[PDB]
Design a protein around this ligand. Structure first.
Ligand SMILES: [Fe+3]
Ligand SMILES: [Fe+3]
Ligand SMILES: [Fe+3]
Ligand SMILES: [Fe+3]
Ligand SMILES: [Fe+3]
Ligand SMILES: [Fe+3]
Lengths: 246, 245, 246, 247, 248, 244
């Protein structure tokens, strides 16, 4: 009737194998010791934030799955916010486990979810490492925008660098894909780039290159696919599953 | 009648180059003969392709920008950088930048923000001299109204906690909302006004209880740049126009 | 009535200022959040080992002072031994604070304690960074060994590289001072080197250089001064103070 | 005689000297240019994209400037002085500047092969692992080797005569700068005589210690020999006016 | 029967037994000091360390080829004074060749780690590390029997960190030389119940106790000399050459 | 004289702290510095032929400008074996003063500045390497001095015309790196140094810097001869030169 933590981890890693993760990505077990324990309640979150972790404790979550890792940069002192987070997780024996870029890259992962939403014709990986998707959007720019506003984020920032003809090349990248080097790279591959976390220098670069950029936010472009992932888990596992920051 | 070198001298008197932080690519970006006579000065935030085309169109012969032309060095000349350099060289337009030295100098871009908010006892925010922090003598709502009226009509507010009157306000013009900046400024201020907020930084601010106001990179720098432009206009017998503001 | 964690820390840092610590040394607060909390029982240990931390919990220690830091190398995952250690400290809100090389180097610190035991004439810092002491031992090698056996370690390992005349130059370094580069450096400054943690290649180097090495162990050469430090805290603070691994 | 698009010239050149033959880090390919559909009437070839070469190109109506050496080895982020003057000339005239560097040194019938064939090296092999240089037996006397050097490459090469050289010796050749201290040490294990360019003092001393005979026929002349072969090759195959600018 | 050998023939024989490509990355194996390898060799000396006393003893005993396990230098130098001056002077004055097989001798079949694995009759032995250093397998006996073997054949009073109880038929890891660094302790704690090696220091002792890994320090010197004696016997059996040991 | 006293005299003239970062100056090969020295040899290079000659002529202390090794080693075979064997077997001390001798007062760069009688000489680089000042004469007069005192057939890169009373930079040894050409072109009309190579020649032409390559060997040996005379005037020692 009940699942062990290691069995949940096994199921997740079958869906999104850890070796799909890009170099250096802190995927896998973040916080935990005994993985033979039976799990009462699974929580899903975009971020292992202090609010999310307090909510997990509040809601009786003992297996906390997040997309973003707890720490990118390693530390050797435990004070302030990280102290408050670890204290809640350790005192309550809550396991924290992450699937980050392996969940972005895998089949039916976060980037596939976007490609399917826009029904990309002949989709291909955007980067060599498997991040992102690119293909033809069979419709007008205005229809593309409507889908974006309806399903992802209502007031996306649009950098309308040039006019966009019907049946354009659409690149999608869930999360933060709007770095300067990404703008330069994707400008060679697509007419329109849908992603998150636009900043000023990247906006200027897109305008110079004629790449239309749509910032539908880091949060919404990932949560769209995370919601799919949650349904997938719910359909397949005999486990109570809740979302914490979406 | 003014030579390019005396415009440069005037600017460098206001914002000495050694105020720029280590590694900042400040000073002459593109140019050769600085004895050249300058009839029309253009000021811009960005040396973008459209700014450079506009410079050429308006007959600008000295183009001042806040952001340097290149941050990372290159050794091939194709695409966008080719198009930009071709316009500058073809018209012998001098391109000169004052970047963090203009952020840091007295009455520079960060001081302009500190003065707008009338910060009491203002101090540099970082050791390298970037940013300002001091007491805002008023309510958070009064601080917001000033922001909306003079800087940006609808800033993003990450309202991480309640803010009492006479709070500590830190300001940094441009991009000051990196993850390490959020962590640092959270120890020094109740409210942080800057530009270019992204997701991980928003989350950090909420965790730390630092209220962040993103009035955009563009608007927080342009506010002080306009003041810098009027200063140049008051002191130089030169036609001076702005190109991207 | 009770003193706060921050005033215990202030007292310690007055004796051994953090800026005395050598470059890269992970000194100061290791684990903790609220330093305004009141402290009823201070525990002192050489090592923040798992057994020391369990003993702290068992004995009701709320402020754990150790000489060695919890971590030298930073981490970004929390499992196994470090998980168990942090869990005990955090669930019980035990503060862990360390003074490492700043306690080695400061006046009347661990190296001064050794120099004073041997009544070194005109003692000087051994290294430029302030680690270790060197001066004249006004007596015979045999008298020096008897002092070592009575006060530090009952059976020290002696690498008797050459004969030692009376009134020789003695270098002392508490803890691990017997690295290969230290042997070479100290051989130019002393006839006899008293420290801890001898290994094979260092023994050979000492023999080649004619440097007499006395390994009284890493543990005993630090514990000697740590006891002095504990007495000093006990004399000055109105606090219950116990030792955990000595 | 007809006009060619710039991209068609680049294609031909890269067929002869593929870019993936260039050693790690070498800045080969398009140096300065945007539109490669540009129509080319006159191709200029040079060893160096020097200021005098580029001025000569402008003067002579060159539309496509090929050089062996890249314009920049180390990247820059300011454009003043000499580089400003060079770019201004190239951009004002939209002259394309393209380079094939070590990929031209290494390819079949490239600059090093040209030397190896000149000396009729028996069973020639690549000298370095990366494919630079050639080494094989010279079937003749040291004096005959020197005469060949004098007749075809450079009239008065500097000879570091570290030891006597017997007939049928192992000869290593490297066009351009091949006389670094580390090259001397490496080649001394592989050859009796080393023909290259740009000898300096420490390298001379090292060669004398190791007994390696070094012949400095100069960086310029050892590359220009093969570059002339390359120019002749282009002229035979392309219906283009082709001129040389610094040789 | 007893004859002279050229140095290159000795080197070829040693490298057949312990190929240089077995040595781990960065290990300074091979020719340490020497020029002409056609040199005729009458007397081969074997040592753990190319120490000053070993090199003096080599000179005194007329050793023409000095084999050592540890290389003369780990870190490169560009000045020649003090002890290294004294050492090189003795070798060069007498043209004594100094040659080393270090981790290639640790790793090769019947090398120093195999010697330990065979001594403890390890069941189904495997390399302990990826690079081939060390061996690990089941010790078919009690911990006390393991300890008895250690005391009789390796070192009489080994330091024992008895982090936990050890049942019969436990997993034993062995590493000849210095194998008791902190990172080795952490690594081996996942692969064995008991770790036999040398050069224990305080931090490593604490870590072993935390992890429950039983550590036996039978010393760097003795855990290598055990296999080096085997190696010497092997050379003596195969080469018609006078062979002596210098620091064992 | 003891070796340590010779070393003391040299280091008083050319303190080791004047040497640039990373320069391997001081004792190269030696143990006992109480050794009695009857005969001192001076050389530019501690080459194998110099070291053989030192042995042949009975030299006890070998002073060289260039250090024995720039890059460290951990094996001793081939040429370095042969060199060390000669020095150690004979306990010949090898000691070097390299850039500290280039930089010190009346050192190798000052020797050149004094030969050309440079007006108001200044160090060329911040680290003290090289000298620059006005040459009070014609380019042709400068060339004549160069040919008579330094090197008979210097290579001249005549990048532009040179007027009388021009700014002259001098650097003994290897001063013609690409980065040096660019730097010096801002500070001088004419650059006198050694070891010219192709790319540096092209840069000098582009920049209009006249470069005179009087060779690495001759521009250092000129000042080394002066140093040898200075040692000879002051020390009661037999002193010979080995590669000049
Ligand atoms: Fe993300
Ligand atoms: Fe900015
Ligand atoms: Fe310690
Ligand atoms: Fe070349
Ligand atoms: Fe060993
Ligand atoms: Fe030199």
């Amino acid at each position: 009737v009940n699942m062990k933590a290691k069995e949940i981890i096994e199921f997740i890693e079958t869906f999104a194998p850890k070796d799909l993760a890009i170099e250096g990505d802190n995927i896998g077990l973040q916080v935990g010791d005994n993985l033979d324990k039976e799990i009462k309640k699974l929580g899903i979150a975009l971020d292992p934030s202090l609010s999310v972790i307090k909510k997990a404790e509040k809601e009786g979550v003992d297996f906390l799955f997040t997309h973003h890792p707890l720490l990118k940069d390693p530390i050797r002192n435990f004070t302030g916010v990280i102290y408050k987070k670890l204290k809640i997780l350790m005192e309550n024996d809550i396991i924290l486990y992450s699937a980050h870029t392996n969940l972005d890259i895998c089949k039916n992962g976060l980037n596939d979810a976007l490609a399917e939403l826009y029904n990309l014709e002949n989709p291909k990986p955007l980067y060599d490492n498997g991040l992102g998707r690119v293909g033809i959007f069979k419709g007008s720019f205005e229809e593309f925008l409507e889908i974006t506003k309806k399903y992802i984020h209502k007031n996306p920032i649009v950098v309308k660098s040039k006019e966009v003809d019907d049946n354009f090349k659409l690149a999608v990248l869930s999360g933060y894909g709007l770095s300067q080097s990404s703008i330069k790279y994707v400008a060679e591959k697509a007419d329109v780039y849908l992603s998150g976390d636009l900043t000023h220098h990247s906006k200027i670069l897109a305008e110079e290159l004629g790449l239309v950029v749509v910032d539908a936010t880091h949060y919404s472009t990932e949560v769209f696919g995370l919601k799919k992932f949650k349904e997938f888990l719910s359909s397949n596992l005999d486990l109570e599953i809740i979302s914490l920051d979406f």
